[PDB]
Amino acid sequence: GTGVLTESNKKFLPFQQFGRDIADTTDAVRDPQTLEILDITPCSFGGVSVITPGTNTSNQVAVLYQGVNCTEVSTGSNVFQTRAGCLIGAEYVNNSYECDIPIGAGICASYQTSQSIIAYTMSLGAENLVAYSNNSIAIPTNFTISVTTEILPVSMTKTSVDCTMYICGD
Amino acid sequence: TMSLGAENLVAYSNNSIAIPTNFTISVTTEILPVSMTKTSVDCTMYICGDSTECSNLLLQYGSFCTQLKRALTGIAVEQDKNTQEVFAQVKQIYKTPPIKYFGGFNFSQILPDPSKPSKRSFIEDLLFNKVTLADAGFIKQYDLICAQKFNGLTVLPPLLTDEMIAQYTSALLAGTITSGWTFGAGAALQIPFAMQMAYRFNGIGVTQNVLYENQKLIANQFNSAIGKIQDSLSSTASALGKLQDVVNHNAQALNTLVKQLSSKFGAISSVLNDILSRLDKVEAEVQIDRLITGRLQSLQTYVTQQLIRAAEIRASANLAATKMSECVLGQSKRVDFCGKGYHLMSFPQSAPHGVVFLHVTYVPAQEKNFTTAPAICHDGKAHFPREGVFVSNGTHWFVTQRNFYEPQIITTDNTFVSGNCDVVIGIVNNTVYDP
Amino acid sequence: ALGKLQDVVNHNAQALNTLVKQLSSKFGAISSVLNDILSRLDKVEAEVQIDRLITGRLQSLQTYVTQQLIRAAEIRASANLAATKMSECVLGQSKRVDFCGKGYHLMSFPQSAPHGVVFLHVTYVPAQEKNFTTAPAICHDGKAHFPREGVFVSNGTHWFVTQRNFYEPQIITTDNTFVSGNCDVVIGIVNNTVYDP
Ligand SMILES: *[C@@H]1O[C@H](CO)[C@@H](O[C@@H]2O[C@H](CO)[C@@H](O)[C@H](O)[C@H]2NC(C)=O)[C@H](O)[C@H]1NC(C)=O
Ligand SMILES: *[C@@H]1O[C@H](CO)[C@@H](O[C@@H]2O[C@H](CO)[C@@H](O)[C@H](O)[C@H]2NC(C)=O)[C@H](O)[C@H]1NC(C)=O
Ligand SMILES: *[C@@H]1O[C@H](CO)[C@@H](O[C@@H]2O[C@H](CO)[C@@H](O)[C@H](O)[C@H]2NC(C)=O)[C@H](O)[C@H]1NC(C)=O
Ligand SMILES: *[C@@H]1O[C@H](CO)[C@@H](O[C@@H]2O[C@H](CO)[C@@H](O)[C@H](O)[C@H]2NC(C)=O)[C@H](O)[C@H]1NC(C)=O
Ligand SMILES: *[C@@H]1O[C@H](CO)[C@@H](O[C@@H]2O[C@H](CO)[C@@H](O)[C@H](O)[C@H]2NC(C)=O)[C@H](O)[C@H]1NC(C)=O
Ligand SMILES: *[C@@H]1O[C@H](CO)[C@@H](O[C@@H]2O[C@H](CO)[C@@H](O)[C@H](O)[C@H]2NC(C)=O)[C@H](O)[C@H]1NC(C)=O
Ligand SMILES: *[C@@H]1O[C@H](CO)[C@@H](O[C@@H]2O[C@H](CO)[C@@H](O)[C@H](O)[C@H]2NC(C)=O)[C@H](O)[C@H]1NC(C)=O
Ligand SMILES: *[C@@H]1O[C@H](CO)[C@@H](O)[C@H](O)[C@H]1NC(C)=O
Ligand SMILES: *[C@@H]1O[C@H](CO)[C@@H](O)[C@H](O)[C@H]1NC(C)=O
Ligand SMILES: *[C@@H]1O[C@H](CO)[C@@H](O)[C@H](O)[C@H]1NC(C)=O
Ligand SMILES: *[C@@H]1O[C@H](CO)[C@@H](O)[C@H](O)[C@H]1NC(C)=O
Ligand SMILES: *[C@@H]1O[C@H](CO)[C@@H](O)[C@H](O)[C@H]1NC(C)=O
Ligand SMILES: *[C@@H]1O[C@H](CO)[C@@H](O)[C@H](O)[C@H]1NC(C)=O
Numbered sequence: 103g104t105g106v107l108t109e110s111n112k113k114f115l116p117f118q119q120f121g122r123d124i125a126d127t128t129d130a131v132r133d134p135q136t137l138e139i140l141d142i143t144p145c146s147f148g149g150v151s152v153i154t155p156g157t158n159t160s161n162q163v164a165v166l167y168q169g170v171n172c173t174e175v176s177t178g179s180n181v182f183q184t185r186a187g188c189l190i191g192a193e194y195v196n197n198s199y200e201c202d203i204p205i206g207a208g209i210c211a212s213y214q215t216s217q218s219i220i221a222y223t224m225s226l227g228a229e230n231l232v233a234y235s236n237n238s239i240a241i242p243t244n245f246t247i248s249v250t251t252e253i254l255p256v257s258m259t260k261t262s263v264d265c266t267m268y269i270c271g272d
Numbered sequence: 273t274m275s276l277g278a279e280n281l282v283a284y285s286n287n288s289i290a291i292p293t294n295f296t297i298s299v300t301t302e303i304l305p306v307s308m309t310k311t312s313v314d315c316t317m318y319i320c321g322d323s324t325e326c327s328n329l330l331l332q333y334g335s336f337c338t339q340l341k342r343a344l345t346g347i348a349v350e351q352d353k354n355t356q357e358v359f360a361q362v363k364q365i366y367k368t369p370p371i372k373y374f375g376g377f378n379f380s381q382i383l384p385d386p387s388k389p390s391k392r393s394f395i396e397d398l399l400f401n402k403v404t405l406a407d408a409g410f411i412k413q414y415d416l417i418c419a420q421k422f423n424g425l426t427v428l429p430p431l432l433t434d435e436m437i438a439q440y441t442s443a444l445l446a447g448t449i450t451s452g453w454t455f456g457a458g459a460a461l462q463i464p465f466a467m468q469m470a471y472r473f474n475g476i477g478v479t480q481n482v483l484y485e486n487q488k489l490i491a492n493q494f495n496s497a498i499g500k501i502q503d504s505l506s507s508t509a510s511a512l513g514k515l516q517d518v519v520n521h522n523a524q525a526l527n528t529l530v531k532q533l534s535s536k537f538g539a540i541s542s543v544l545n546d547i548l549s550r551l552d553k554v555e556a557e558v559q560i561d562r563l564i565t566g567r568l569q570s571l572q573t574y575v576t577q578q579l580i581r582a583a584e585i586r587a588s589a590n591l592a593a594t595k596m597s598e599c600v601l602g603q604s605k606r607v608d609f610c611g612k613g614y615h616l617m618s619f620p621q622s623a624p625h626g627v628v629f630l631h632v633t634y635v636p637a638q639e640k641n642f643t644t645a646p647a648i649c650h651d652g653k654a655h656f657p658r659e660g661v662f663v664s665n666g667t668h669w670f671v672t673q674r675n676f677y678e679p680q681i682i683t684t685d686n687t688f689v690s691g692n693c694d695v696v697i698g699i700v701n702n703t704v705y706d707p
Numbered sequence: 708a709l710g711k712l713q714d715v716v717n718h719n720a721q722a723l724n725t726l727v728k729q730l731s732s733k734f735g736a737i738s739s740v741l742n743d744i745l746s747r748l749d750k751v752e753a754e755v756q757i758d759r760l761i762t763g764r765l766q767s768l769q770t771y772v773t774q775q776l777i778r779a780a781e782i783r784a785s786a787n788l789a790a791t792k793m794s795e796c797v798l799g800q801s802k803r804v805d806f807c808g809k810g811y812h813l814m815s816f817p818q819s820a821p822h823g824v825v826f827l828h829v830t831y832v833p834a835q836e837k838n839f840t841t842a843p844a845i846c847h848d849g850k851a852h853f854p855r856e857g858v859f860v861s862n863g864t865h866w867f868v869t870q871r872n873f874y875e876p877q878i879i880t881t882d883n884t885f886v887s888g889n890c891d892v893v894i895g896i897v898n899n900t901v902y903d904p
């Protein structure tokens with residue numbers, strides 16, 4: 103196998119020699135020479151996603167190592183820690199704007215100005231408190247006739263497949 | 273034999289009408305799933321964990337893994353779209369002024385509490401306590417989940433945090449309370465809550481003087497209903513059944529996918545390393561192919577089940593978005609759509625992977641028999657009610673509303689004439705007063 | 708502009724292209740070409756490879772049909788929604804909120820598009836609002852007068868009754884209002900004169 107061997111405190115009985123897991127993978131072993139218990143762990147791995155504005159715009163990209171602390175990480179000096187992982191190549195900004203490239207856990211990324219990729223907390227909207235009281239009513243004095251557009255799919259492509267021709271052509 | 277219900281025959285006749293004389297303000301609860309767990313699967317790690325020979329043999333089977341990954345990513349994006357559609361229906365983050373005199377109604381249990389770290393409400397916190405999440409997708413530093421992670425199955429965190437969902441529901445609630453349905457059309461227009469409730473009463477066919485002359489009773493009934501909602505959501509643990517069921521189904525699917533790795537599928541062993549160590553390349557290729565095919569079919573079944581369940585969740589989220597648009601951003605004339613009874617309003621609350629609507633409805637309470645008539649003859653003309661129904665308590669005739677007994681003397685302002693008194697079936701004789 | 712329709716077309720085209728490209732996979736056979744297997748092997752030896760190719764391509768077709776069935780269910784739901792919007796927004800005026808566009812719905816106009824429909828929803832949106840002082844009712848001669856259709860407003864000195872969606876103040880008369888009981892119950896009642904025509 104391949105993995106990291108660590109000292110273990112598992113309570114192996116004197117007759118046992120190895121331990122299994124849910125998927126029947128050996129998670130602990132007994133050293134044949136020095137009868138100690140070793141825990142076997144997968145070494146280290148994770149997903150790597152690439153945040154990028156279109157290649158029409160810029161070839162500069164940011165990288166997201168998903169679900170890892172910013173210590174187990176090509177690698178710029180712009181590391182940032184999101185609940186979704188470690189974000190390298192994005193300058194975190196205390197401002198908040200509308201989400202442009204959703205990264206996760208409320209963190210979004212955009213390409214903005216000397217332009218660079220920035221990461222920020224997405225903005226839900228501008229705050230607005232209603233001037234409410236028990237003898238005040240706001241009544242409109244004018245109107246606006248708006249024309250909105252709504253697009254709805256209706257049908258799709260009618261496809262036909264020749265099973266014999268596709269599988270066993272002539 | 274199961275019972276459909278208690279039999280009940282309606283005392284019907286052609287000159288008898290039952291009209292309610294009192295009402296009840298009910299607050300029902302409706303739970304709707306919105307999103308599910310965003311899962312990601314590493315095809316190579318799941319099928320051929322750290323094995324070059326298995327990976328090389330897996331390259332033969334084409335692009336099954338790429339389309340499994342594409343399907344999972346599509347579902348993952350769809351979940352955030354569902355949440356955004358249900359909750360992000362408000363253009364601005366509204367908020368109420370510090371004064372909390374909403375015409376005697378007590379909204380303190382649904383408005384946010386600043387004391388808590390997350391600015392959730394009391395009922396929202398109860399809802400979050402009633403549902404336990406197997407995994408939120410957050411960072412897991414160095415179980416039934418470690419086995420999943422080591423085999424390539426991970427969970428992605430949702431784009432909108434629970435705090436953002438709480439802020440969205442707070443904006444919706446503040447807009448509803450301080451502006452009625454006006455914030456769903458254009459800019460929010462402030463209006464006293466008593467006047468907003470008077471409009472809501474007018475919207476179901478009851479005159480506003482009923483609300484104004486019974487304001488304290490209605491406020492007390494609403495407060496009692498909210499308190500009963502609190503008690504029910506704090507007592508019965510099995511309250512949010514649907515959301516917990518969604519979480520359980522996703523977790524069970526992942527656990528089944530992991531346990532499928534211990535199947536031999538006809539090979540000598542389920543462990544790739546044992547096959548590699550005990551057999552030559554020619555002999556081990558057959559066993560590795562069997563394991564690859566079995567695990568690929570298991571992944572296919574998991575993705576198919578996920579796609580069908582995601583379609584179901586998308587339908588539920590569309591329904592929740594419609595209920596937010598129609599029940600919360602306005603008053604609904606649709607029957608049994610925003611709760612049982614005549615709909616007055618609704619209040620949204622977030623919950624793990626779902627939304628909860630507190631539907632406030634008006635239910636007639638105490639009905640009485642009366643003798644009715646389609647029309648009335650005064651001077652050879654037939655008088656019909658402009659808005660209401662003719663009733664009689666035994667000796668005198670009045671005209672009342674159709675949903676609340678408020679009899680008034682039959683005058684020419686209440687009624688309109690149409691033709692003579694030789695056509696209407698069931699007409700009666702009475703005097704119509706002239707102001 | 709028409710993102711959804713183009714997305715549908717792209718998804719179908721991509722599915723067909725994937726189905727075609729699956730024909731170049733060996734699936735464990737010596738070759739992905741049927742003719743090469745037939746020419747280089749005897750019947751007994753070639754049957755195994757042909758079976759492997761047949762099984763792989765059959766599974767690929769199964770995946771394509773399953774994806775198509777799920778996507779067709781999605782498109783059918785969308786088409787049912789479009790039919791409902793045609794019935795309610797175009798063939799009539801809708802009271803449902805945010806169903807035929809944001810705002811108070813006036814009308815809608817349909818337009819065709821490749822594999823889809825486009826609705827131009829005409830809606831009415833209030834524009835310029837002003838503050839006013841309001842009151843649930845009014846006392847004239849010991850009776851409480853409530854608006855028949857509208858809301859009582861005041862510009863600072865005088866009291867009028869207006870519509871709820873458009874400021875059109877009118878003198879409070881007995882035709883605008885109706886009486887209900889006395890003036891000892893309503894909370895927030897005010898004092899004003901009701902004109903008698
Ligand atoms: C209501 O709004 C409309 C436009 O939103 C106003 O019409 C404009 O009036 C100004 C001043 O006379 C003109 O310069 C514009 O050309 C008009 N626009 C249009 C489209 O007609 C209208 O005056 C407003 N009414 C009130 C009472 O404020
Ligand atoms: C309508 O029903 C409500 C309650 O359903 C009645 O209010 C109750 O009245 C009794 C008698 O005065 C009190 O003891 C209760 O405390 C009241 N309850 C509440 C919640 O206020 C009301 O009296 C009924 N009205 C009519 C006309 O029957
Ligand atoms: C609205 O209801 C809440 C509770 O349902 C009220 O808060 C209670 O107030 C009493 C007296 O002030 C306290 O003894 C309780 O401990 C409070 N409970 C909670 C949970 O806060 C609140 O006072 C009500 N609102 C109004 C305006 O009366
Ligand atoms: C039906 O309602 C009428 C209207 O109130 C009743 O007539 C009144 O009865 C009371 C008895 O307490 C008298 O004091 C009033 O003078 C009566 N008014 C008129 C205009 O007649 C009548 O008694 C009711 N009848 C029944 C059977 O309930
Ligand atoms: C309602 O009143 C009318 C008029 O008072 C009644 O019509 C009378 O009916 C009797 C008997 O059929 C005739 O003799 C009269 O000539 C009718 N008068 C008129 C003016 O047409 C009618 O019968 C009454 N209805 C009831 C149910 O009592
Ligand atoms: C509120 O509206 C009333 C009604 O128009 C105003 O009263 C009028 O004010 C104008 C001033 O230009 C006078 O010419 C009229 O004679 C007044 N009419 C009456 C019946 O009094 C009043 O001034 C307005 N007040 C405010 C604060 O806007
Ligand atoms: C509205 O008008 C009524 C009647 O003009 C006022 O009622 C009077 O109140 C005073 C002070 O409480 C009493 O001394 C009078 O006897 C009352 N008159 C009547 C006929 O009841 C009432 O106070 C006024 N309301 C406001 C807010 O000014
Ligand atoms: C095994 O051999 C090693 C060295 O060859 C020795 O140090 C150790 O004590 C031995 N242990 C046993 C159980 O024989
Ligand atoms: C380049 O692509 C971006 C998409 O991020 C778009 O906003 C921009 O307008 C494009 N520019 C050109 C010149 O096509
Ligand atoms: C990362 O590890 C450090 C210690 O090595 C710890 O203090 C920190 O909380 C960790 N952060 C995350 C997000 O795991
Ligand atoms: C954001 O603000 C905090 C304090 O409010 C500060 O410590 C931090 O350096 C700021 N970040 C940036 C990128 O300026
Ligand atoms: C409005 O409510 C406040 C309590 O917050 C009260 O003091 C005030 O008198 C009320 N105004 C009217 C006009 O009733
Ligand atoms: C009601 O209908 C019955 C027939 O079932 C009839 O005999 C009776 O006269 C009717 N009552 C009135 C008031 O018309």
Ligand SMILES: *[C@@H]1O[C@H](CO)[C@@H](O)[C@H](O)[C@H]1NC(C)=O
Binds near residue numbers: 283290639640641
């Ligand atoms: C009306 O009278 C009938 C007569 O049998 C009775 O059954 C019914 O309960 C009464 N309805 C009400 C509301 O009292």
Ligand SMILES: *[C@@H]1O[C@H](CO)[C@@H](O)[C@H](O)[C@H]1NC(C)=O
Binds near residue numbers: 233240836837838
């Ligand atoms: C009404 O008055 C309040 C007082 O603060 C103000 O904030 C609000 O903008 C006013 N509304 C309108 C429509 O002018």
